[PDB]
Design a protein around this ligand. Sequence first.
Ligand SMILES: [Zn+2]
Ligand SMILES: [Zn+2]
Ligand SMILES: [Zn+2]
Ligand SMILES: [Zn+2]
Lengths: 912, 913
Amino acid sequence: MADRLIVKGAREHNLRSVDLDLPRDALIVFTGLSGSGKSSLAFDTIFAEGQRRYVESLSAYARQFLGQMDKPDVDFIEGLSPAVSIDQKSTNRNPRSTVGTITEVYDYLRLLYARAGTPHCQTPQQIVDQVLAMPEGTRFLVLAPVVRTRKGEFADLFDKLNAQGYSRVRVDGVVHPLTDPPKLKKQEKHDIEVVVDRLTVKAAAKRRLTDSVETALNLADGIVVLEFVDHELGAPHREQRFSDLEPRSFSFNSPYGACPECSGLGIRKEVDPELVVPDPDRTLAQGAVAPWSNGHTAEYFTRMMAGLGEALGFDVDTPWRKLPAKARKAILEGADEQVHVRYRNRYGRTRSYYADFEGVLAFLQRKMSQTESEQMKERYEGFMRDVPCPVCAGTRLKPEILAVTLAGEKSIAEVCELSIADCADFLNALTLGPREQAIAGQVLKEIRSRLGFLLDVGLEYLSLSRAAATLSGGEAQRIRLATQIGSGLVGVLYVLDEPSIGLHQRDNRRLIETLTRLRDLGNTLIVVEHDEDTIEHADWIVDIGPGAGEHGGRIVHSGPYDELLRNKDSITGAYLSGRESIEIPAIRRSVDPRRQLTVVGAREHNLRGIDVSFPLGVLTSVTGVSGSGKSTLVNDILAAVLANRLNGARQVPGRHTRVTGLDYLDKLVRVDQSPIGRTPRSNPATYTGVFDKIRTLFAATTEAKVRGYQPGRFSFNVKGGRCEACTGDGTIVPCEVCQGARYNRETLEVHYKGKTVSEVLDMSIEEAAEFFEPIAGVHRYLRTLVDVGLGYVRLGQPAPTLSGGEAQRVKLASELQKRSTGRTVYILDEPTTGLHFDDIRKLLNVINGLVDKGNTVIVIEHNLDVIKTSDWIIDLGPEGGAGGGTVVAQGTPEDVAAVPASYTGKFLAEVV
Amino acid sequence: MADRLIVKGAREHNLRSVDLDLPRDALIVFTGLSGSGKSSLAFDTIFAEGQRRYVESLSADFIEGLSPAVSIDQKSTNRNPRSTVGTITEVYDYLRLLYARAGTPHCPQQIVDQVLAMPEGTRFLVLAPVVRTRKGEFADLFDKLNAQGYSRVRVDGVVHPLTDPPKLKKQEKHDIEVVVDRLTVKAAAKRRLTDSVETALNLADGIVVLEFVDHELGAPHREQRFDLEPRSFSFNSPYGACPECSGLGIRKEVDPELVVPDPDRTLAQGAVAPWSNGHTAEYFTRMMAGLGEALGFDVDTPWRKLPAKARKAILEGADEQVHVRYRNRYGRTRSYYADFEGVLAFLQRKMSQTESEQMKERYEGFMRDVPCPVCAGTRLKPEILAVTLAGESKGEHGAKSIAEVCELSIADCADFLNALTLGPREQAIAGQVLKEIRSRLGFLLDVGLEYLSLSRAAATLSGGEAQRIRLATQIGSGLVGVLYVLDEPSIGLHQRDNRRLIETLTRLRDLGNTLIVVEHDEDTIEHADWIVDIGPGAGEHGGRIVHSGPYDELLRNKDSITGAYLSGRESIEIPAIRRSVDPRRQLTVVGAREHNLRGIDVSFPLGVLTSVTGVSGSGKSTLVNDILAAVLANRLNGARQVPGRHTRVTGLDYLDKLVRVDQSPIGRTPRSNPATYTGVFDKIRTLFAATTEAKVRGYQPGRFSFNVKGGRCEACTGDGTIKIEMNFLPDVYVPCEVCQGARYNRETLEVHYKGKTVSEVLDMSIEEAAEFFEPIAGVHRYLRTLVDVGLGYVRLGQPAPTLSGGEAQRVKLASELQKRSTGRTVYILDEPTTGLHFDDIRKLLNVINGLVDKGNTVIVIEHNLDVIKTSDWIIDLGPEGGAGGGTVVAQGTPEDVAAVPASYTGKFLAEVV
DNA sequence: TAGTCACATCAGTGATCAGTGGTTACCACTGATCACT
DNA sequence: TAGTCACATCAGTGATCAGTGGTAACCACTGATCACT
Ligand SMILES: [Zn+2]
Ligand SMILES: [Zn+2]
Ligand SMILES: [Zn+2]
Ligand SMILES: [Zn+2]
C-alpha cells in the first residue's frame, strides 16, 4: 500500500522541470512567495491535470457534457487521484445565489417540505394494522374514493359500475344501491367514494373487508377509506385513510409557483437598515453619506443637501450626538419640494441634479431610478436599502400556496426571513414522529451534520435572509471549507488555497485539528498556509523559488525538515533562523496623546461599540480573530470614510459613530488582498498607469515624430498598434511577421535610446534599474519596485502567468509615500498570503525605513514576529463570532504580551 | 505498474461479500454462466465506485485502488439513425475540428509584400483605391471629406479632385470608389505608398485597389484588390446542416427491384412482399387479379418467363379505378375504393400515414428509393463542404470537395489525409494528434476492415464489426494502466473475424493497460493472463469466486467448467446420417444476389441440424437470417419483413412453421424475471387461480403476479429490496420488513397451493421445484427444459440483470422445439455461445441433438469448432471480408467443408477436428 | 360412411402500453485610453 | 515685498463601452401482457 504521488516535468512560467513526491497520510505544505511558481503548481498543474484526465474521456452523456469547456495546459502527471480544489470563486456577483444555495440546504429543505406535506384543508401492514386495532362490534361502512375531486355528472359511471354489479355506491356521504342510484348533475359538485360493502365489524369478517378494500386497491391504485357509522370516536363521522386546496405540482423556480416581482431566488432583505447614515458622531461636512463623498459628485450632492440642511435647521458639520438623533432621522426622511441649486465639480463638468428627494432613503431611490450609471444604481441599493417582497414575504412561492402549505405543518417566511442558526436549531426541533422521525435513514443525520459543522467552526452569526453580497472574508473562507468537509470521503486528495484570510491563528489552532481529523479518516491534504504551525507537521516539506525569476528557477528545499534550520537560503527557514524576525525595538514613543485617532460606538453586526485608539506616525497593527469585527472597523468603517472624504472614494461608512483627528489627517491609501490577476490584458505596467507614460516618452523620440506615431497608436490593445497576424496575443508559434516580438515592422523602427518597446519589456527590471533614472515618475515606480525586491517581473507580463497575491504588491510599493509628511495612513492587507516571512521581513524593512521617514501603516496581520517588530498592537475581540467586537489591549507589543487576555499578546509573549 | 485494486464489501443479490486484492498489469476476464454473479460483480464493484466518485465531483461499495474506467455496455451505444458511423468512431467531430483548424477556402503587410517580392524596376499605374460603395446625395459628406482633406475622389465612374464634386441625386446609383492619392510605382517608395493605403484601411473598412485608371483597360485591373464565406461551424445544429433533410443521413433505400426476390413463385402466392400478409395478402391479390383480368397479362407464370410488359404493368399499376371490396381471414372487410398504383406510390402514402416510425424502416429502405440529393450523404451545408477542401490538397494533390465519411472508405480517406498540405504552416510540427489518429487507424487496418467503407451505418451494421469498432475506439486512446470495463459488446461470430482484432489487445498490453472482459467467446479466452470464474451457481447462492488468473490454474481447476472443453473432457458429435437424404428434401436458396451475395445457391438440408460458418458479417448472416429466415417466416407463419434477393426457394412443402431467435439479452430491468419472460409465470398464475384458497375472489389470476398492483408490497417495488437512494449514491440491497428475501406480500402468501406458497415456489430453484407440479405437464415440460439446458439451480424469482442471457434466454425457444410433434418445424438460431458457458453449451447441444433426432430442422449461426462439429452440415460463406464474401466456399458435411480448399472454417477444422 | 363425443388447453401468431433514455441572461468588474484640474 | 518674476509633469482621481470573462422532440428499445383464430 504505497502512499506516494509523483509529479515529473511540470513546466509553467518560471516553474520548470519539477519532479516531486507528495506523501499521503500526512499534511504537506508548499512554502514560498507570490510569484515563485508555488501557486501555479498547486493550482493549475496538478488539479488541472486531474480534472482534464477525468473529463476528456466522455462527452456524449448528458451529465458530464457540461464539462470540457475548461482548457488546461499541463504536460503530464502519472499516479494521480481525483483531487478537489478549495478556493474562493470570484464570480463578481451573487444575487441569484443566496447563502442557502451555496451550502446545499435549499434543495434538501424542499425535499423535506415535500416529505411531510399536509395542506390542512403504504404497505399491506398499513392495510391490516388499523382493522386489527378496530374495535369489535362496531357498525361501519367501506369507502372507495376513486373519483376524487372529479366533480360532475356520472350517470355513465353509474351504468359502468352496474356492469360489474357492485350493488352499492356512495356520493358526498349519502349511501345508495347501484340498482337505485341518485341523480347526478354536471354543474353540481360530486365527489364519488363508492361503497364497496355496507359491512360491519364482526367475527370472521376480515375476508369481506379484504375483498372490498382490494377492489379499490386494484382500481384506484392503493387508496381506500374506512368510516365509523355508529360510534365515530374522534370526529362526528370518524374516518380512516388507506392511501383553497390546489395540489397540482410543486416548484420553486417556475413562473407557475413563484412571485411575479422577486422572480425567484431574489430576496431584498439585505444586511441592515440605517446603514446610509448610521454615524451619530462624524463631521457631517466631511461626507457622512457615500454619494456626498464621490470623486466629483461629492459637491454635486452636498450643494442642495447643505441647502436643505440650512432650510430645515440642522447643522452642516456638527456631529449628531450634540444634536439629537432627530437629525439623522430627518436626513433619512428629508422633506419634499426642490430648491435652486447648481455647482461645478473638480472634473470641470457641470451636472444639474434637479429633482425632488424625500431624504436619503428616497434620494438614493431617485439615484437608482434616474442615474445613467447602471452599476452604482444597484450597488448602492444592496447595502442600505431594504425593500423585500411584500406579496410573498420575500419567499419563492406563489401568493396562494405559501399559506396552505404550512397551514397543516401559516405563511412562508423561512429561508428568506430567518437566520442560519435559527433555522439550524428549528429544523430538528420538530419531533413530528411517524413521517420524518421514524427510521434512522439519512434525513435527521444530514440535517444535523452540516449545521453542527457550521456551529463548531463558528458560522452561527450568518443569516439566510441576509444578502449574499454581504459575505465577510471569514464566511467566504469557512463556508467553502464546511461544504468540502461535509462529504468526508476517504482517500480523496484535497488542495487548498491560503487559509489565513478569514481565520485567526487561534482559529488555525482548530483548523489544524480538523485537518488531522480528516487525515485520520484516511485522505490526503495539501495546504499553502505557510504558518509555522502547519510547518513542522509535514514529514517531507518542500520549498520552491529561491528567486521568483529566472535567477532562482530551481528547487531550493525538499526534505525531512531537519536541514531547514541550517539552510538559510530558503525563506521559510530564514524566518526561524532569522537574525531579522526579531523584536527590533523601536522608539514606540512616537504616539501622541492628542495627535491620535479614535473610533467609538461602532454597533456593527460584527462589532459591539468599543473605542479603538489608533496612534499616528507608528506601525500600529490591528489584530484579533477574523470575523470578530476588526475588518468591519478598520476597513469597512475607517478606511471607507477617510477614502471617500480624504482622497475621493465612494464606499459607505457603515455602522459606527466617530473618527477623530480630522485636522491631523491629509490622505489615505488602501491596498487590499485583491487576487485579480487572470486576464492577459492586465499587466504590471498597464493598470499601474505607467505604460501610457512609457508610450508618451517613446513618442517623444524623433523617429516616432516623423513617422506620425502617437502614444495611443503605440499601445498593444488598440487596433492601431497591434498587427492582425498576432491577433494581439504576441504568440499564437509566434506571429510570422513579428518573429516573437509582438510589434509590427511599421512600429518597431522606433529605436529610442538604441532600444524598442519589445527590447525594454524583454530586459529584466533588475538590469533595467540603470534605465529610466533621469525621468522622474518611471524612476520612482522602478525604484520602489526594486525596494520591494521582486524586480523579476516584466512590464508587459500577462496576468494568467502572475501568481495570485502579488497583483497589488507592485502598486503598494508606490502606495506608501504621499506628501512626504508622511503620516498619510496606509491600510495594509496580509503579506502572509503569498509572500513568506522573509519577503514579509524585506517588506518590513521598507515599512520601518519609511516610517522612520514619517509614514503610518494600519495592518491586519496573521503571523507573530512581523507585528512583534511593530511598535503598537490593538487586539479587537478575543473570541470568534459574537464573542468579540471589543478592544482588549492597546499599546506596546510587550504590553499586550504581559496581558493574559489577548491571544495576540500571548503569542508575542511565549517567544521573546 | 502495480496499482493494487482492492475489492471490499462487494455483494449484490447473488453476490455475497467478495473481497480481493490484485496488481494492475494484465487482462482480467470473467467466466462462468451468463450473469450468475459475474454480471453484478462487473457492475456494483467497479462501475458503482466510479459512479460514487464522479457524481460527487460533477457539482453543477467503498472501493479503492481502481482507475477511472470507460463503459462499453450494450445501452451506451446501439443503432440510431441520428448518429452516423463517424461519431461512434469519434472521427466525425475530430476530423471536423482538424478541418476547421487551418483550412483554406480556395476562391496591411501583404499589400507591400507583393511589391517587395515583385522585382524592382517595373511600371504599373497604382493610382486609385476603392472605398465602400455608397449611393444618394453626398454634398455634406463630401464637404466633411474636404474638411478632413483628401484632394482625391472617384464617383459616378469618373475621377475628380476632392475640390470638384460632381452631380449626385438620391435616385441615382453610384459605385463609389474614391481615390486617396496620386502616387505611382517607384524604387524604395514604400514609405510613400504605405501612407497612401494603411490610413485608407481605417476609412474604407479594409478595401483598397491599385486599378489601371488608364485607357485600354485590357485586363480588369489585373484582378487586383485588397467564392468565400466564414459562416458558422456546427454539425448537430441547423447552422451548417442540410436545411431540407434536417442534417440526417441519406436514406439509401436500394434496391427498387426488391419487390419480387423469387420470380419462379407465382405472383398470386405473394411474391411481392406486401402481397403475402396475414390479412392484406388477399387485400392486394384482389386488385392485382383485377388488373390481370383487365389488361390481360399473365400472372401465375414466373416473372422471368413472363413478358416485360406484364412485369412493368404490375410494378407501376395503372390509372382509373375499379369496384373491388373483399374480406380478410380475421373477419374484417376492407372497402379499398381507389387506384392501384403498383407498389411504387402506395408505399409512400403508407409510411406517410403511419404514426409508428420503426415498422417503416423495413418497408422503406428495402422497397423503393426516395432520398434527398441536396446533401447526398453529407452532414454539412452545400457550400462549406466544397469550400473547405477546395484549398486542401489531398492524396495526389487533389482539392475539390470534402467526401470523407460521405463518399470514401477508411483506406483511401486515410491515405489522402496523410498527404494534407495547407502550406508551410502545418509542416513545422506533426503534433500528438497525428499519432492519436495513426494508432487506431493502423489497428483498424491490421484487423482487416479496409473494405469497411465510411458509408456504413445502422442499416448495414453487424455484431462483429460492432465489436471491431468498439474495441478500436477504446484502444485509440492508448493510455497506460487505465481500467477498461466492457461487457460482451456483441456475439462471437468467427475465428477469422476474431483472433485478428485481439492482436490489438496484445499490442496494447505492452503499454500496461488493464481491462475487465465479460465475454463468453472462446477466442478471447486462452490468449489472456488473468481469468476468474464467477457463478458456479446462478441463484442468490451463486455468488462465488472459483478460478484463479493463470491458465495453468485453469488446467488445475475443475469447478471452472471451461476446462471441460479446454482439456477435452467431453464433446458432442454429428448425429449420424440422421434423416438427411441427398436429392429429395433439401431446401435450396438459389440465385441469392443480395447487397453482399453474388447470385449463389446454398443447399440447407431438411430434417437436419445445420450450421453456417465462414467470413461473418460478409453476407452469411444475411444469407441465413435476412433472405432465408424472412422467407420462411413470411410464407410459413405470417411475418412482415422483406427477405431481399433470391431467385427460388425449394422444399418449403416440407415445412409447416418457423421459429427465429436473435441474440436477445434478457434485459437490465429487475422487474423482469425468467418466470415472466419464458412464459412459465402466465400458466403459473393460471394454476394459482385454481387453488382452493385462491378461487374465492372475483378478480382474475392477475392478482398473483409481481408486476401488477394486486400482489405487490409497496415497500419493495417487486424486488425484495428497498433500492431507494438519491443520485449521489446507488444504495446497497437490503431485505424488506415484509419479504426478508421473499419479494412478495404476506396477504397473497396465504395461498399454500399443495402446501407451497407463492413466495416459496418462487424461492426454490427449478431443480427442487421439478418434483413439484409434476402431474400437470404444462409446467412439467418447461421445468424439464430449464433443468436440461443447465438452469437447475437458477432462482425463478430473480432479477434479470444478474442472471443468464445466453442459456435461460433461449429456453423460450428450446421448450417449443416440440412444435406440433412432427417435429421438422424449421428453426433459425443466433449464436448461442454468447452467454453460454461450456457445461450449459454441452447440455443445450445434447437437448438440441435429441430434438433434431426426434426429427427437427435447425439452422444455427455458429463459430466454435465443437458446436459446428456437433452439427451435421456446415455451410461456409465468404472467400473474404465484406464485398469479397457472399459466395459459398464449402457447403456440405463438416468433412465436406474441410474438403473444399476455400473455407476458413475448413482449415480451422484441419488443425483440430 | 356419416352425425355421434366437454363449455380445453395449446404456441405462438405477433400490434399496442408501459417501464425507462437521453436532452437545453438585464446586470456585473475589472480592462482601459484619454477623456479633466 | 512690491505685479509678474520660467518652465511641465506625478497622482490616483468618474463614466462606459469595449471587447476577456461564466451557455423536447427524437421517437430510436425492448419487454409485458395481451386481442385474435
Ligand atoms: Zn417575491
Ligand atoms: Zn505579429
Ligand atoms: Zn439532406
Ligand atoms: Zn417487500
